[PDB]
């Protein structure tokens, strides 16, 4: 998990909809601080879909590896309009970046 490659992926593919800093503002998508070890639909103040609430999983490496390959397939009906990342390494590198940036 290369975080520098993952940071560069996050800017290209997520940064327009997401922030990672603690106390970062909600944008189109929720602020991602505290993502790891947290159930879905748990960012305070963000309006999720009923689909995201119906999932009810714990966000970690394995659930993020499968979600980011195809979000519509993992959480059907989600309003996150992202096609997905096909390459293992980009998802693994991006998750390595998320593990450091979202944990303050
Ligand atoms: C807008 C154009 C987005 C882009 C690009 C990315 N995301 Fe996203 N994300 C967006 C929305 C609107 C939502 C809410 C989904 C819903 O149904 O309510 C999300 C959600 C997530 C989540 C789940 C957060 C949670 O369950 O608490 C994660 C983990 C997430 N987004 C990550 C993520 C990554 C890693 C992205 C790029 C690689 C990315 N998102 C792109 C909006 C948008």
Swiss-Prot record:
One of its GO terms (cellular component) is mitochondrial intermembrane space. The modification N6-succinyllysine is found at residues 55, 72. Its main location: mitochondrion. The modification N6-acetyllysine is found at residues 72, 99. It is found in: Mitochondrion intermembrane space. GO terms for molecular function: electron transfer activity; heme binding; metal ion binding. It is linked to Thrombocytopenia 4: A form of thrombocytopenia, a hematologic disorder defined by a decrease in the number of platelets in circulating blood, resulting in the potential for increased bleeding and decreased ability for clotting. Belongs to the cytochrome c family. This is Cytochrome c. The lineage of its organism: Eukaryota, Metazoa, Chordata, Craniata, Vertebrata.
